[PDB]
Amino acid sequence: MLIAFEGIDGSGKTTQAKKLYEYLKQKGYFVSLYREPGGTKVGEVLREILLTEELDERTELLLFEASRSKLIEEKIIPDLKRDKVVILDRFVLSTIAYQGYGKGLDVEFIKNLNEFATRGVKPDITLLLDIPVDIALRRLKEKNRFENKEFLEKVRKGFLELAKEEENVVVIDASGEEEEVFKEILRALSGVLR
Amino acid sequence: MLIAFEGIDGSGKTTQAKKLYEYLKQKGYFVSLYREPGGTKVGEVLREILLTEELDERTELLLFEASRSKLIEEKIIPDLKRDKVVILDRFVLSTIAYQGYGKGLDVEFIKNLNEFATRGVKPDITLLLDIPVDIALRRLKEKNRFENKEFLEKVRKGFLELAKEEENVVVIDASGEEEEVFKEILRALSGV
Numbered sequence: 001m002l003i004a005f006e007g008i009d010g011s012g013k014t015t016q017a018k019k020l021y022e023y024l025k026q027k028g029y030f031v032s033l034y035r036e037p038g039g040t041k042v043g044e045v046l047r048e049i050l051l052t053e054e055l056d057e058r059t060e061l062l063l064f065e066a067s068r069s070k071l072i073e074e075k076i077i078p079d080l081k082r083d084k085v086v087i088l089d090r091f092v093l094s095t096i097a098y099q100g101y102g103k104g105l106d107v108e109f110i111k112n113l114n115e116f117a118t119r120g121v122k123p124d125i126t127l128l129l130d131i132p133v134d135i136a137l138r139r140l141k142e143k144n145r146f147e148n149k150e151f152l153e154k155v156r157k158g159f160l161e162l163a164k165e166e167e168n169v170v171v172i173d174a175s176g177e178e179e180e181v182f183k184e185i186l187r188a189l190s191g192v193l194r
Numbered sequence: 195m196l197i198a199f200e201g202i203d204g205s206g207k208t209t210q211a212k213k214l215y216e217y218l219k220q221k222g223y224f225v226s227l228y229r230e231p232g233g234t235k236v237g238e239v240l241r242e243i244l245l246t247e248e249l250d251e252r253t254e255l256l257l258f259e260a261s262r263s264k265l266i267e268e269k270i271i272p273d274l275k276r277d278k279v280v281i282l283d284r285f286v287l288s289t290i291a292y293q294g295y296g297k298g299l300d301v302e303f304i305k306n307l308n309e310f311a312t313r314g315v316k317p318d319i320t321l322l323l324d325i326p327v328d329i330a331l332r333r334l335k336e337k338n339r340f341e342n343k344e345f346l347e348k349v350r351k352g353f354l355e356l357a358k359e360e361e362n363v364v365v366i367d368a369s370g371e372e373e374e375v376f377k378e379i380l381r382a383l384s385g386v
């Protein structure tokens with residue numbers, strides 16, 4: 001069971017993924033939670049480079065993918081073979097939305113790199129935490145973080161287009177309150193998982 | 195002018211590249227010399243990961259390309275626009291030969307990654323320093339370095355196959371002595 005949380009910065013997806021992780025643990029599932037980029041020693045090194053250094057968009061794409069490849073090989077593939085529920089804070093749709101829709105790189109090229117890095121592993125379900133950019137920015141403002149409105153509008157749109165096209169993507173209204181959002185999440189998971 | 199040195203570990207390509215850099219500098223060219231992976235601040239961080247850590251082959255592929263992308267964008271493309279002679283100690287054929295012929299990753303997929311990382315920048319000439327694996331291992335043994343014979347035989351073959359197929363790749367007999375190898379390098383360079 002692979003569960004992917006996706007969406008823009010300020011959508012609450014980190015918080016919600018952690019919330020799901022603790023909920024599923026309590027219900028007796030064996031659960032893993034990983035962030036992208038990161039989630040492995042090598043991954044976190046790359047994550048630090050990605051968040052620190054001034055990188056061109058091609059180099060960035062290759063590093064996000066390298067981080068995913070490490071995660072898939074070292075953690076996710078073994079976890080899944082052990083019937084762990086794997087929860088991801090970002091996955092392959094983040095790359096298409098950010099590097100494709102946002103930075104203008106080729107979407108079919110991105111999808112081939114995603115395939116390559118994941119060895120074709122796909123989520124059972126992707127939760128897209130959709131939120132207006134203005135509301136996301138407000139929320140980040142409270143935690144003292146600032147992101148680019150023009151860029152995030154493209155990204156948001158990208159995500160919503162992917163949720164129509166791609167398989168197994170449910171759109172969550174992440175503008176609501178924390179418990180309300182979480183119960184929408186539990187509803188979209190029902191069926192797929194008890 | 196972009197000049198790429200390629201070949202297996204122990205072929206002398208590092209030494210020859212530095213020898214060509216100093217030679218062309220003396221003749222009044224404006225020259226750069228970079229190694230792959232590496233050659234930029236970010237690239238050297240990736241290089242250390244690649245040389246230190248236990249990596250699967252797909253992650254390795256992606257990091258070699260990330261390093262290339264950084265190098266291309268930050269240094270090579272600006273160096274070329276300024277008519278510098280850019281000398282590379284390894285480039286795209288090393289990726290195909292090591293990750294493709296050696297580790298078994300798809301060669302066409304590698305060629306597409308190479309294209310993407312380079313923005314299509316291609317050498318004017320590639321010097322393949324071909325050498326028997328046994329001789330290369332003997333030379334590495336003297337500097338106290340040990341590499342995998344089975345793996346390097348596949349890589350050497352891959353290189354040779356690429357020198358037949360790919361454009362502007364000249365095979366140099368890197369088994370000779372230093373000055374003799376450098377003479378063949380200057381000969382091949384006198385074609386471009």
Ligand SMILES: Cc1cn([C@H]2C[C@H](O)[C@@H](COP(=O)(O)O)O2)c(=O)[nH]c1=O
Nearest residue numbers: 009010036037064090091094095098099
């Ligand atoms: C996984 C991934 C993240 N990112 C970005 C989104 C965020 O701005 C940052 C990850 O941080 P966040 O989840 O901590 O907001 O990296 C990409 O641009 N592409 C990717 O493939």
Ligand SMILES: Cc1cn([C@H]2C[C@H](O)[C@@H](COP(=O)(O)O)O2)c(=O)[nH]c1=O
Nearest residue numbers: 203230231258284285288289290292293
């Ligand atoms: C540039 C490059 C090098 N390599 C290998 C060749 C060497 O073993 C090492 C580069 O370091 P060296 O040439 O300084 O020993 O990494 C690849 O496997 N793929 C690549 O794309």
